[PDB]
Design a binder for these strands. Structure first.
Ligand SMILES: [Mg+2]
Ligand SMILES: [Mg+2]
Ligand SMILES: [Mg+2]
Ligand SMILES: [Mg+2]
Ligand SMILES: [Mg+2]
Ligand SMILES: [Mg+2]
Ligand SMILES: [Mg+2]
Ligand SMILES: [Mg+2]
Ligand SMILES: [Mg+2]
Ligand SMILES: [Mg+2]
Ligand SMILES: [Mg+2]
Ligand SMILES: [Mg+2]
Ligand SMILES: [Mg+2]
Ligand SMILES: [Mg+2]
Ligand SMILES: [Mg+2]
Ligand SMILES: [Mg+2]
Ligand SMILES: [Mg+2]
Ligand SMILES: [Mg+2]
Ligand SMILES: [Mg+2]
Lengths: 86, 122, 137, 116, 99
RNA sequence: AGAGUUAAAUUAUAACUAAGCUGUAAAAAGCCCUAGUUAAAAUAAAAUAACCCACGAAAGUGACUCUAAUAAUCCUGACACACGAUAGCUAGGACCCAAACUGGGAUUAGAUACCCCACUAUGCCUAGCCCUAAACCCAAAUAGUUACAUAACAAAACUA
């Protein structure tokens, strides 16, 4: 509002394909959480409720992170087995 | 150097700027301050539009004043810069050269946490 | 071909024109896309309104005007009324998160109008006023 | 990097107050979950709307606009072919990853030890 | 007679120090299509992929040059009492035994 | 705890332009002194950082600046002393926005509810009260050990 206009959350379209520009914008906003934030501010969410969410999210993230880590570590051993029909 | 005065002055011509800086520093020495140095960070377009003294401002001159002052007086100087119509926006910070840098020895890596659960066999 | 996603700052020498105009001189298409309705207003660079079209203006009624189709129809209409007053290129400003966002944009293109830049200015409070309570107690 | 687990859970030893309250214990399971099937949305809606405008304008005589009819048809054919042929390849190829069956087998070959 | 300690102290595996980034010599004892099972003499074999350049020169019995990363691939995962062994070693296949 | 300050929103209020705007699973009622854009004090609340885990005795505390400042050469200890979320009370001031209550609209067999719209006490500031919470990490304080050793579940078992 007091900032200069058009410098922010702005994407310029290339070779006239708009769908792509918009996609890029939406990716920018998804990445910075602006989208989730917008969506979550439609209604209010009482502090305890928010505390609970943050905690659940962080648990969830820890688990996904670690499972992923174990996948990428175990990934080598998916290769065809040498010892078949031993 | 003890306090740092961040001055954003209305953008003006040479003589009037010089005048504003002079009267400002004088006020500082009257609240009992000892002025170490005067730095000029130039005039720029302000990051956003700043409304002060029934004026909506776009550009501004930037200055730093390092000075020592009795703890009591920061409120006084603050009051003074408040009502000067040539100042776009004043601030007084504990001088960043007083705080000294401790040594990051490095990043101590944190091991995954163990024994959060018992040895139960599900 | 060097193509910057970032717009052309005013103080810059930067030379790009669309029909001979600077990036600053191009008209603005404001689009407010809200959950029950989508509104569009094309305006001069100098902020004189050229054209206005909404899903209500387009003769849909209560729930139907929520949908994407409606939004698109408003887009086309807006662009017609706009090209009448002779605006070839327009910079989109999308305000709000709704069912009609994308649709009203590509309706602006469908309706024979050229979109150069598409900006999102959605109110995001940095915590001002408390929004209304949650549904289903 | 994984978020820190130190000090987070409520335990007899921990000095401070809990940060996480996990709903179910944080122990890596020996299988992964099954991929969530994509929610569908209507297809061809744009071509439909264009054809409907063409009709409203020309008073619903089909001879008047053959292009939008034919293109709406073309599109519905591409949505049928899409529904048929995408099911199988989305159900097999995960790209850089493995089908959840293979992951589960791989994870049973090198399981987690909660016990001992 | 040589005390075990004396042997351990002089062995080439003690001489190496940390096994990260060490040039080593290894020998291929098993093959599945592109997979070379290489014994470099430590504990676990490693397994590398047959390179594109001179692919047919790599045969059971061949000798190759390796860059050792980790002597055993091991990690602890969330909720586990002990680490998990892949029962393998981590290496990069360089070329074959320039001689 | 004081004192000072404000970026993003929001609103009084004008200026253009449009007839609608709002609202839902869907409507109605409401508003058209309305809506979009451009300008804007006050008030209130503090995106991101935070995948951090700090401060405080606890309750609590995460916009910015400065001033003052975080007991004990550190065992336990009250009914004594001093504090203590929200709500609530008294008096004065504020009022953007939210909202018990209430009034309208739907829904329903009914609907003194859930859903929609308006609006109040109240949420804010000053001063005084009130002394309660699933004030729960349902795990007393201070030193310790990992020996013996599985009711079950849970956050492993124990000594003084
Ligand atoms: Mg309840
Ligand atoms: Mg503490
Ligand atoms: Mg539970
Ligand atoms: Mg503001
Ligand atoms: Mg007022
Ligand atoms: Mg009505
Ligand atoms: Mg903030
Ligand atoms: Mg102390
Ligand atoms: Mg005591
Ligand atoms: Mg109280
Ligand atoms: Mg109160
Ligand atoms: Mg009162
Ligand atoms: Mg009120
Ligand atoms: Mg309300
Ligand atoms: Mg009623
Ligand atoms: Mg006070
Ligand atoms: Mg509590
Ligand atoms: Mg109790
Ligand atoms: Mg006690």
């Amino acid at each position: 509002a007091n900032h200069l206009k058009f410098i922010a959350r702005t994407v310029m379209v290339q070779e006239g394909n708009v769908e792509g520009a918009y996609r890029t914008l939406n990716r920018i906003l998804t990445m910075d959480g602006l989208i989730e934030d917008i969506k979550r501010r439609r209604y209010y969410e009482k502090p305890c409720r928010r505390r609970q969410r943050e905690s659940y999210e962080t648990c969830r993230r820890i688990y996904n992170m670690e499972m992923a880590r174990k996948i990428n570590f175990l990934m080598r051993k998916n290769r065809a087995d040498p010892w078949q029909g031993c | 150097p003890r306090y740092e005065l961040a001055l954003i002055l209305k953008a003006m011509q040479r003589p009037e700027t010089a005048a504003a800086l002079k009267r400002t520093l004088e006020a500082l020495m009257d609240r009992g301050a000892v002025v170490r140095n005067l730095e000029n960070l130039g005039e720029r377009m302000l990051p956003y539009k700043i409304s002060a003294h029934n004026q909506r401002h776009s550009r501004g001159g930037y200055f730093l004043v390092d000075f020592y002052a009795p703890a009591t007086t920061v409120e006084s100087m603050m009051e003074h810069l408040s009502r000067d119509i040539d100042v776009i926006r004043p601030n007084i910070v504990k001088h960043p050269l007083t705080q000294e840098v401790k040594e990051c020895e490095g990043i101590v890596p944190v091991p995954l946490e163990e024994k959060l659960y018992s040895t139960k066999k599900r | 071909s060097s193509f910057s996603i970032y717009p052309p700052i005013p103080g810059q020498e930067n030379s790009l024109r669309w029909a001979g105009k600077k990036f600053e001189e191009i008209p603005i298409a404001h689009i407010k896309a809200s959950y029950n309705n989508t509104q569009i207003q094309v305006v001069s660079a100098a902020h004189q309104p050229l054209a206005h079209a909404s899903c209500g203006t387009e003769g849909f009624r209560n729930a139907k005007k929520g949908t994407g189709i409606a939004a698109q129809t408003a887009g086309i209409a807006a662009a017609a009324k706009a090209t009448g007053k002779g605006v070839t290129h327009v910079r989109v400003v999308v305000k709000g998160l709704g069912p009609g966002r994308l649709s009203a944009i590509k309706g602006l293109t469908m309706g024979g109008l050229e979109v150069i830049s598409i900006t999102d200015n959605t109110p995001i409070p940095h915590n001002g006023c408390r929004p209304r309570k949650a549904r289903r107690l | 990097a994984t978020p820190s687990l130190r000090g987070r859970l409520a335990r007899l030893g921990n000095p401070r107050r809990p940060i996480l309250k996990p709903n179910k214990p944080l122990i890596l399971a020996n299988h992964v979950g099954e991929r969530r099937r994509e929610k569908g949305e209507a297809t061809c809606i744009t071509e439909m709307s264009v054809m409907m405008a063409c009709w409203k304008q020309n008073e619903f005589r089909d001879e008047a606009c053959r292009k939008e009819i034919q293109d709406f048809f073309d599109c519905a054919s591409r949505a049928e072919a899409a529904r048929k042929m995408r099911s199988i390849q989305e159900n097999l190829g995960e790209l850089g990853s493995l089908p959840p069956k293979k992951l589960n087998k791989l994870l049973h070959r090198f399981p987690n030890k909660p016990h001992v | 007679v040589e005390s075990f300690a004396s042997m351990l102290r002089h062995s080439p595996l003690t001489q190496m120090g940390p096994a990260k980034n060490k040039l080593v010599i290894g020998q291929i004892f098993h093959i599945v299509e592109d997979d070379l099972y290489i014994d470099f003499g430590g504990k676990f074999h490693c397994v590398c992929k047959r390179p594109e350049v001179d692919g047919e020169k790599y045969q059971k019995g061949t000798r190759v040059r390796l860059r050792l990363l980790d002597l055993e691939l091991t990690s602890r995962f969330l909720g586990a009492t002990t680490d998990t062994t892949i029962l393998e070693a981590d290496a990069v296949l360089l070329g074959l035994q320039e001689s």
